[PDB]
């Protein structure tokens, strides 16, 4: 799935980039402590999953 | 080299090692933002 | 008179100098003076 690997991996990259900026900004505004504590959760869950996906797909493309 | 699967990220790999030193620079952007209080 | 904050002009000025000197170090390996 050489294109599905690079999909996951760019998803993973894009989502790292979104969280590198979002997580520290979220953390230092007390106006949205609860607006966004679900987003870091969803983001964090999303993130670990992509690592796993890319870790198993590696072994069908590399 | 990286496995051909990852080749397209070669230039991102090429730049990642410098990223820890940007953390150091970033503290100075930060302190200047807060006026070096 | 005083609107653009100081920390921002520093950052921009700072990245600008990084680039100009980075280029000079690039040139130490390319073209004239690279020994090649």
């Amino acid at each position: 799935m050489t294109i599905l690997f690079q999909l996951a991996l760019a998803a993973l990259v894009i989502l790292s980039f979104v969280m590198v900026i979002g997580v520290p900004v979220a953390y230092a505004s007390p106006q949205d402590w609860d607006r966004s504590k679900q987003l870091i959760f969803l983001g964090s869950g999303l993130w670990i999953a992509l690592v796993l996906v890319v870790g198993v797909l590696n072994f069908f493309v590399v | 080299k990286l496995p051909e699967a990852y080749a397209i990220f070669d230039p991102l790999v090429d730049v990642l090692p410098v990223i820890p030193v940007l953390f150091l620079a970033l503290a100075f952007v930060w302190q200047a933002a807060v006026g070096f209080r | 008179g005083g609107r653009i904050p100081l920390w921002i002009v520093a950052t921009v000025a700072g990245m600008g100098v990084i680039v100009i000197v980075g280029l000079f170090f690039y040139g130490a390996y390319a073209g004239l003076g690279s020994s090649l």
Binding site: - | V15 | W7, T11
Partner: peptide, 30 residues
Amino acid sequence: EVIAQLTMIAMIGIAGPMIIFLLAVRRGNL
């Protein structure tokens, strides 16, 4: 190319200042 590497580090490099920037706009807790 080299244009690849430079666009990554341009993006990576504006990432840090942009956090400070957003937290100042959002009158956050610097």
